[PDB]
């Protein structure tokens, strides 16, 4: 109903379109799988060691093998997030060093945001929705691996209570990427100008898509604080594993992201 609000609607639709093309497992598909809907197939459930071995047939010790699988999927997600970032208007026109800095510090916050879409209080979807690993099984793994996912479930349960959908999440993750407060940025003003447009589009999106949810925009921005805490704790646990497991190797792409965080 306004020239400016029409541009914000166009930006919201552009990003939702790019989000669908970049991320193969959407929140809508994940919910259809988690709530037994007829549009998708039921997953094989891994709740103990026997189901894990039968799951490896259907779909290093156990804990390290699961940890390696998570880091493989995180590498895949970095690739998907990088592809999505390039579709955000203005992102590819930024200084190349700043594009790398924004992704270095942004990918982990986005991974945990999108991981919540695959989670409920009972567990997490794996193998592109083919499987489901229980929260209790992950918590039963030998230390320090049994503590890696628990804080992610705590965040996911709170974040999922906002009931965001894919069109909401597309603009939210773009806002996370264009954060002008990352360490080492050379040209902050161009980044903040883009983030302002994205925040304007996110605000209008949440008002139209959730007309009964008061201050959902503020509640969602307050979750960006929960995401930082999760990222910091995750890095601390990786340092513990680095010294305890001299045999374990971390992917080069993930190695560069963690350096000097």
CSV table of C-alpha atoms in Angstrom, one decimal:
chain,number,residue,atom,x,y,z
A,1,UNK,CA,0.0,0.0,0.0
A,2,UNK,CA,3.1,2.3,-0.4
A,3,UNK,CA,6.0,2.6,-2.9
A,4,UNK,CA,8.5,1.8,-0.1
A,5,UNK,CA,6.5,-1.1,1.4
A,6,UNK,CA,6.1,-2.5,-2.2
A,7,UNK,CA,10.0,-2.6,-2.5
A,8,UNK,CA,10.2,-4.4,0.9
A,9,UNK,CA,7.7,-7.0,-0.2
A,10,UNK,CA,9.7,-7.5,-3.4
A,11,UNK,CA,12.9,-7.9,-1.3
A,12,UNK,CA,11.1,-10.5,0.9
A,13,UNK,CA,9.9,-12.5,-2.1
A,14,UNK,CA,13.4,-12.3,-3.7
A,15,UNK,CA,15.1,-13.7,-0.6
A,16,UNK,CA,12.4,-16.4,0.0
A,17,UNK,CA,12.9,-17.5,-3.6
A,18,UNK,CA,16.7,-17.7,-3.2
A,19,UNK,CA,16.3,-19.5,0.1
A,20,UNK,CA,14.2,-22.2,-1.5
A,21,UNK,CA,16.8,-22.6,-4.3
A,22,UNK,CA,19.8,-22.7,-1.8
A,23,UNK,CA,18.5,-25.0,1.0
A,24,UNK,CA,17.1,-28.4,-0.1
A,25,UNK,CA,15.5,-29.3,3.3
A,26,UNK,CA,13.1,-26.5,4.2
A,27,UNK,CA,11.4,-26.0,7.6
A,28,UNK,CA,8.1,-26.9,5.9
A,29,UNK,CA,9.5,-30.2,4.6
A,30,UNK,CA,11.1,-30.9,8.0
A,31,UNK,CA,7.7,-30.3,9.9
A,32,UNK,CA,5.9,-32.5,7.5
A,33,UNK,CA,8.4,-35.3,8.3
A,34,UNK,CA,8.4,-34.6,12.1
A,35,UNK,CA,4.6,-34.5,12.4
A,36,UNK,CA,3.8,-37.6,10.2
A,37,UNK,CA,2.3,-35.8,7.3
A,38,UNK,CA,1.3,-37.6,4.0
A,39,UNK,CA,3.4,-35.4,1.7
A,40,UNK,CA,6.6,-37.0,3.0
A,41,UNK,CA,8.2,-40.3,4.2
A,42,UNK,CA,8.6,-41.3,7.9
A,43,UNK,CA,12.2,-41.4,9.1
A,44,UNK,CA,14.2,-44.3,10.5
A,45,UNK,CA,14.8,-43.6,14.2
A,46,UNK,CA,18.2,-43.9,15.9
A,47,UNK,CA,17.7,-44.1,19.7
A,48,UNK,CA,20.5,-46.6,20.8
A,49,UNK,CA,23.5,-48.5,19.5
A,50,UNK,CA,21.5,-51.3,17.8
A,51,UNK,CA,19.2,-48.9,15.9
A,52,UNK,CA,22.4,-46.9,14.9
A,53,UNK,CA,24.0,-50.1,13.3
A,54,UNK,CA,20.7,-51.0,11.6
A,55,UNK,CA,20.4,-47.3,10.4
A,56,UNK,CA,23.9,-47.4,8.8
A,57,UNK,CA,22.5,-50.3,6.7
A,58,UNK,CA,19.1,-48.7,6.0
A,59,UNK,CA,20.6,-45.3,5.1
A,60,UNK,CA,36.6,-44.7,14.8
A,61,UNK,CA,34.2,-45.2,17.7
A,62,UNK,CA,30.5,-44.4,17.6
A,63,UNK,CA,30.8,-40.8,19.1
A,64,UNK,CA,33.7,-39.7,16.8
A,65,UNK,CA,31.8,-41.2,13.8
A,66,UNK,CA,28.7,-39.2,14.6
A,67,UNK,CA,30.8,-36.1,15.3
A,68,UNK,CA,32.5,-36.5,11.9
A,69,UNK,CA,29.1,-36.8,10.2
A,70,UNK,CA,27.9,-33.5,11.9
A,71,UNK,CA,31.0,-31.7,10.7
A,72,UNK,CA,30.5,-33.1,7.2
A,73,UNK,CA,26.9,-31.7,7.1
A,74,UNK,CA,28.1,-28.4,8.5
A,75,UNK,CA,30.6,-28.1,5.6
A,76,UNK,CA,27.7,-28.8,3.2
A,77,UNK,CA,25.6,-26.1,5.0
A,78,UNK,CA,28.5,-23.5,4.7
A,79,UNK,CA,28.3,-24.1,0.9
A,80,UNK,CA,24.5,-23.6,0.9
A,81,UNK,CA,24.8,-20.5,3.1
A,82,UNK,CA,27.5,-19.0,0.8
A,83,UNK,CA,25.3,-19.6,-2.2
A,84,UNK,CA,22.4,-17.9,-0.5
A,85,UNK,CA,24.6,-14.9,0.7
A,86,UNK,CA,25.5,-14.1,-2.9
A,87,UNK,CA,21.8,-13.7,-3.7
A,88,UNK,CA,21.4,-10.9,-1.0
A,89,UNK,CA,21.2,-7.6,-3.0
A,90,UNK,CA,24.5,-5.7,-2.5
A,91,UNK,CA,26.5,-8.6,-0.8
A,92,UNK,CA,28.7,-9.5,-3.9
A,93,UNK,CA,29.4,-5.7,-4.5
A,94,UNK,CA,31.0,-5.4,-1.0
A,95,UNK,CA,34.8,-5.5,-0.5
A,96,UNK,CA,35.9,-9.1,-1.0
A,97,UNK,CA,37.6,-9.2,2.4
A,98,UNK,CA,34.4,-8.1,4.0
A,99,UNK,CA,32.4,-10.8,2.2
A,100,UNK,CA,34.8,-13.4,3.7
A,101,UNK,CA,34.6,-11.8,7.1
A,102,UNK,CA,30.8,-11.7,7.1
A,103,UNK,CA,30.6,-15.4,6.1
A,104,UNK,CA,33.4,-16.4,8.6
A,105,UNK,CA,31.4,-15.0,11.5
A,106,UNK,CA,27.9,-15.6,10.2
A,107,UNK,CA,27.8,-19.2,9.0
A,108,UNK,CA,27.8,-20.7,12.6
A,109,UNK,CA,24.9,-18.5,13.8
A,110,UNK,CA,22.9,-19.5,10.6
A,111,UNK,CA,23.7,-23.2,11.0
A,112,UNK,CA,22.2,-23.2,14.5
A,113,UNK,CA,19.2,-21.1,13.3
A,114,UNK,CA,18.4,-23.6,10.5
A,115,UNK,CA,19.3,-26.7,12.7
A,116,UNK,CA,16.4,-25.6,15.0
A,117,UNK,CA,14.1,-26.2,11.9
A,118,UNK,CA,15.2,-29.9,12.0
A,119,UNK,CA,14.7,-30.3,15.8
A,120,UNK,CA,11.9,-30.9,18.3
A,121,UNK,CA,12.4,-31.5,22.1
A,122,UNK,CA,12.8,-35.2,21.3
A,123,UNK,CA,15.5,-35.3,18.6
A,124,UNK,CA,16.9,-34.1,15.3
A,125,UNK,CA,16.4,-35.1,11.6
A,126,UNK,CA,19.5,-36.5,9.9
A,127,UNK,CA,20.5,-37.6,6.3
A,128,UNK,CA,18.3,-35.0,4.6
A,129,UNK,CA,15.2,-36.1,6.6
A,130,UNK,CA,15.6,-39.9,6.1
A,131,UNK,CA,16.6,-40.5,9.7
A,132,UNK,CA,15.9,-39.1,13.1
A,133,UNK,CA,18.4,-39.3,16.0
A,134,UNK,CA,17.0,-38.9,19.5
A,135,UNK,CA,18.1,-36.2,22.0
A,136,UNK,CA,18.6,-38.8,24.7
A,137,UNK,CA,20.9,-41.0,22.5
A,138,UNK,CA,23.1,-38.0,21.6
A,139,UNK,CA,23.2,-37.0,25.3
A,140,UNK,CA,24.3,-40.6,26.2
A,141,UNK,CA,27.5,-40.4,24.0
A,142,UNK,CA,30.9,-40.5,25.8
A,143,UNK,CA,32.3,-37.2,27.1
A,144,UNK,CA,32.9,-34.6,25.7
A,145,UNK,CA,30.6,-35.6,22.8
A,146,UNK,CA,27.5,-36.2,24.9
A,147,UNK,CA,27.4,-32.4,25.7
A,148,UNK,CA,27.8,-31.0,22.1
A,149,UNK,CA,24.1,-31.1,21.0
A,150,UNK,CA,22.2,-30.5,24.3
A,151,UNK,CA,22.6,-26.7,24.3
A,152,UNK,CA,21.5,-26.7,20.6
A,153,UNK,CA,18.2,-28.5,21.7
A,154,UNK,CA,17.7,-25.9,24.4
A,155,UNK,CA,18.0,-23.0,21.9
A,156,UNK,CA,15.9,-24.8,19.3
A,157,UNK,CA,13.0,-25.4,21.7
A,158,UNK,CA,12.8,-21.7,22.6
A,159,UNK,CA,13.4,-20.5,19.0
A,160,UNK,CA,10.8,-22.9,17.6
A,161,UNK,CA,8.2,-21.4,20.0
A,162,UNK,CA,8.3,-18.3,17.8
A,163,UNK,CA,6.7,-20.5,15.0
A,164,UNK,CA,8.6,-18.8,12.2
A,165,UNK,CA,8.2,-20.2,8.7
A,166,UNK,CA,10.6,-20.4,5.8
A,167,UNK,CA,9.6,-16.9,4.3
A,168,UNK,CA,10.4,-15.4,7.8
A,169,UNK,CA,13.7,-17.3,8.2
A,170,UNK,CA,15.0,-16.2,4.7
A,171,UNK,CA,15.0,-12.5,5.7
A,172,UNK,CA,16.3,-13.3,9.3
A,173,UNK,CA,19.3,-15.2,8.0
A,174,UNK,CA,20.1,-12.4,5.6
A,175,UNK,CA,20.0,-9.9,8.5
A,176,UNK,CA,22.5,-12.2,10.4
A,177,UNK,CA,24.9,-12.2,7.4
A,178,UNK,CA,25.0,-8.4,6.9
A,179,UNK,CA,26.1,-7.7,10.5
A,180,UNK,CA,28.3,-4.6,10.6
A,181,UNK,CA,29.8,-5.5,14.0
A,182,UNK,CA,32.0,-8.4,12.8
A,183,UNK,CA,35.7,-8.1,13.8
A,184,UNK,CA,38.0,-6.9,11.0
A,185,UNK,CA,35.4,-5.3,8.7
A,186,UNK,CA,37.0,-2.6,6.4
A,187,UNK,CA,33.9,-0.8,5.2
A,188,UNK,CA,31.0,-1.0,7.8
A,189,UNK,CA,28.6,1.7,6.3
A,190,UNK,CA,27.7,-0.3,3.1
A,191,UNK,CA,27.0,-3.4,5.2
A,192,UNK,CA,24.8,-1.4,7.7
A,193,UNK,CA,22.9,0.2,4.8
A,194,UNK,CA,22.0,-3.2,3.4
A,195,UNK,CA,21.1,-4.6,6.9
A,196,UNK,CA,18.8,-1.6,7.5
A,197,UNK,CA,16.9,-2.5,4.3
A,198,UNK,CA,16.8,-6.2,5.4
A,199,UNK,CA,15.6,-5.2,8.9
A,200,UNK,CA,12.8,-3.0,7.3
A,201,UNK,CA,11.8,-6.0,5.2
A,202,UNK,CA,11.9,-8.4,8.1
A,203,UNK,CA,9.7,-6.1,10.2
A,204,UNK,CA,7.0,-5.8,7.5
A,205,UNK,CA,7.2,-9.6,6.8
A,206,UNK,CA,6.5,-10.5,10.5
A,207,UNK,CA,3.7,-7.9,10.8
A,208,UNK,CA,1.9,-9.3,7.7
A,209,UNK,CA,2.7,-13.0,8.3
A,210,UNK,CA,2.0,-12.8,12.1
A,211,UNK,CA,-0.6,-10.1,12.7
A,212,UNK,CA,-1.6,-11.4,16.1
A,213,UNK,CA,2.0,-11.8,17.4
A,214,UNK,CA,2.9,-8.6,19.3
A,215,UNK,CA,6.6,-7.5,19.1
A,216,UNK,CA,7.7,-10.7,17.3
A,217,UNK,CA,10.3,-8.6,15.5
A,218,UNK,CA,11.9,-7.6,18.8
A,219,UNK,CA,11.6,-11.2,20.2
A,220,UNK,CA,13.4,-12.5,17.1
A,221,UNK,CA,16.3,-10.0,17.4
A,222,UNK,CA,16.6,-10.9,21.0
A,223,UNK,CA,17.3,-14.5,19.9
A,224,UNK,CA,20.5,-13.2,18.1
A,225,UNK,CA,21.9,-13.1,21.7
A,226,UNK,CA,21.1,-16.8,22.3
A,227,UNK,CA,22.9,-17.6,19.0
A,228,UNK,CA,26.1,-16.0,20.1
A,229,UNK,CA,26.3,-17.9,23.4
A,230,UNK,CA,25.8,-21.2,21.5
A,231,UNK,CA,28.6,-20.4,19.0
A,232,UNK,CA,31.0,-19.4,21.8
A,233,UNK,CA,30.4,-22.6,23.8
A,234,UNK,CA,30.7,-24.7,20.6
A,235,UNK,CA,34.2,-23.3,19.9
A,236,UNK,CA,35.2,-24.0,23.5
A,237,UNK,CA,34.2,-27.7,23.2
A,238,UNK,CA,36.1,-28.0,19.9
A,239,UNK,CA,39.3,-26.8,21.7
A,240,UNK,CA,38.8,-29.6,24.3
A,241,UNK,CA,38.5,-32.2,21.6
A,242,UNK,CA,41.5,-30.8,19.7
A,243,UNK,CA,43.8,-31.6,22.7
A,244,UNK,CA,42.0,-34.9,23.7
A,245,UNK,CA,41.8,-36.3,20.2
A,246,UNK,CA,45.2,-35.8,18.4
A,247,UNK,CA,44.0,-38.3,15.7
A,248,UNK,CA,40.9,-36.4,14.7
A,249,UNK,CA,41.0,-34.1,11.7
A,250,UNK,CA,38.7,-31.1,11.1
A,251,UNK,CA,37.6,-30.0,7.5
A,252,UNK,CA,39.8,-27.2,6.1
A,253,UNK,CA,36.7,-25.0,5.4
A,254,UNK,CA,35.6,-25.3,9.1
A,255,UNK,CA,39.3,-24.9,10.3
A,256,UNK,CA,39.4,-21.4,8.6
A,257,UNK,CA,36.0,-20.3,10.0
A,258,UNK,CA,37.1,-21.2,13.7
A,259,UNK,CA,40.6,-19.5,13.5
A,260,UNK,CA,40.7,-16.2,15.3
A,261,UNK,CA,36.9,-16.1,16.2
